[PDB]
């Protein structure tokens, strides 16, 4: 069941992906609204896949190791230059996260693009599944592919102050490494901004 | 059924899978309008109390169901038993606006007065949690501010509410027993 993703000019093809899972929508809501009065200009040089490291899922991380990433995180390329030199923007974020498992070491990772991350008291982690999520388990699929649309109190919002989405990754079953399974499996999630717009050009120094 | 599962696809099986049948469901009670229509007591403040949600106690019904969704939209019906004329202001009014009293008010009428104060916040839909200051919610998510010389109680009922983006709900803690075992109401003897 090869899935051949694509965004802009970078591709990603995983022969083990189990399936894309749209969260909260299949498409983004209208873009030209009372805010900005129509000065928004879809930018399309930012729709790209960019890697980002995550915690090295180890044999010993017990249930409930929430490694969050807040989005958009510090991008240094085109998206970074863009969020630097533009006042307002919006995106959907078709995240993708991988765990290369040897298929002999059992474990069940749970990735979930939770919106408006607040802290978990470790009772909330039992039912954290409400948010869009995919299970990563070396058993069957080393790859999870989530896409969520931009949802915030506003149409646009400065990414420096209110970062809505935060990819969280809980560990439901400790990596059991058997005789032949990998000792230490790292998780690299590729996050791609989608349907990005901009507005409020800011005078750069 | 044995569905692939790992994709976290929404799978629901019925008792039909073993010579059962599924009876009809009437879920007119677990509805989110009919469950948000009821009053819920917000803590009262004697001077210039500000009326807004996320101040209710977390474990009450409306409070919890509210924290159950990130983005809530709703108009309020408020019930206050104040002791002097009670004045309200919209969402962006300077705190000194409360003494003008030409803005909406209500004079002492015997018991508690019941108002309807619509949803005025400029944000497209409010939030029960805000990641990043712009933990305290920003100053803009209040509905109004109601100021009486002394406020005794405030009840608040959200009309035509609609929620979004569900969140955890956190049922009561249990300790080394089979079930919670709370004394349910029983007839006399």
């Amino acid at each position, epitope marked *: 069941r090869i899935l051949t993703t694509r965004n802009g000019h970078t591709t990603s093809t995983t022969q083990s992906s189990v399936g894309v899972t749209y969260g909260y929508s299949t498409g983004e809501d209208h873009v030209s609204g009372p805010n900005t009065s129509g000065l928004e200009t879809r930018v399309t040089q930012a729709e790209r896949f960019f890697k980002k490291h995550l915690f090295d899922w180890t044999t010993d*991380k*017990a249930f409930g*190791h929430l490694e969050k990433l807040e989005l958009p995180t510090d991008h240094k390329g085109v998206y970074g230059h863009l969020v630097d030199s533009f006042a307002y923007m919006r995106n959907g974020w078709d995240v993708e996260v991988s765990a290369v498992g040897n298929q002999f070491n059992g474990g069940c990772l749970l990735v979930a693009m939770v919106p408006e991350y607040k802290d978990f008291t470790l009772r909330e982690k039992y039912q954290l599944t409400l948010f869009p999520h995919q299970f990563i388990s070396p058993r069957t699929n080393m790859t999870a592919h989530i896409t969520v649309p931009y949802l915030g109190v506003n149409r646009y919002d400065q990414y420096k102050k209110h970062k809505p989405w935060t990819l969280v990754v809980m560990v439901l079953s400790p990596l059991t490494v058997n005789n032949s399974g990998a*000792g230490q499996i790292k998780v690299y999630a590729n996050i791609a901004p989608t349907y990005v717009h901009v507005a409020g050009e800011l005078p750069s120094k | 059924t044995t569905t692939t599962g790992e994709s976290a696809d929404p799978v629901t099986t019925t008792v039909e899978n073993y010579g059962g049948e599924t009876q009809v469901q009437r879920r007119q009670h677990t509805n989110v309008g009919f469950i948000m229509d009821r009053f819920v007591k917000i803590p009262s403040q004697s001077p210039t109390h500000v009326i807004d949600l996320m101040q209710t106690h977390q474990h009450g019904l409306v409070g919890a169901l509210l924290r159950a969704a990130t983005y809530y939209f709703s108009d309020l019906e408020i019930v206050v038993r104040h002791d002097d004329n009670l004045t309200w202001v919209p969402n962006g009014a300077p705190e000194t606006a409360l003494h003008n009293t030409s803005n909406p008010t209500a004079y002492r009428k015997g018991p508690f007065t019941r108002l309807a104060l619509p949803y005025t916040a400029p944000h497209r839909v409010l939030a029960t949690v805000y990641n990043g200051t712009t933990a305290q919610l920003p100053a803009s998510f209040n509905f109004g501010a109601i100021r009486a010389t002394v406020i005794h109680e405030l009840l608040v009922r959200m009309k035509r509410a609609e929620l979004y983006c569900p969140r955890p709900l956190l049922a009561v803690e249990v300790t080394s027993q089979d079930r919670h075992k709370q004394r349910i109401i029983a007839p006399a003897k």
Partner: antibody
Amino acid sequence: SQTLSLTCTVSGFSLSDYAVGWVRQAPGKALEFLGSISTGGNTGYNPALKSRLSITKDNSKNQVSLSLSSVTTEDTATYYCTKSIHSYSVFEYTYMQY
Amino acid sequence: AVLTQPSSVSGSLGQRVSITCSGSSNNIGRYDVGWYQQIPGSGLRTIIYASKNRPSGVPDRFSGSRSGNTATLTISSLQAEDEADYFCATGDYSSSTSVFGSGTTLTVL
């Protein structure tokens, strides 16, 4: 022959939510893991110092107890309590890290 | 004392000073380490648990990197007060008891 037992009243961080474990700083900068007890009650001891201690937790009193076998010239140390995340420890030596 | 870590390392205000932890595929190769800070007149404090995580209240300076067979505690810019003894916490499959680093005791110079 001076069997000792010491407890530290947990302030917040409920034992079911977070499991505690003792650890002692041996004379000098040396450190040594004394045991851990998972939130449910199951414990994991230091196999070296094993059979010499007992770690019993009570959910009501909101405290935890450690009953060591006896004291010697090496047993004297600055003792400390820990609040690990990951309330159940997958491995006994694994907790030392969190 | 299974983990050998620099017995001492010297620092100055302004620059980035890191501290390796000398481990092996037994304990640091497949298991995550911890970094504790101990002042002369104070006990322990946890700086980096789970190796790459930072607990509540620690300044953004401290960064924990486990890349490679030797964990490194990387400080952005050493400060005159962050001068303290750092310890290594990790789990080794070979011995039930965990291994603890002897220390690194910083200086300001």
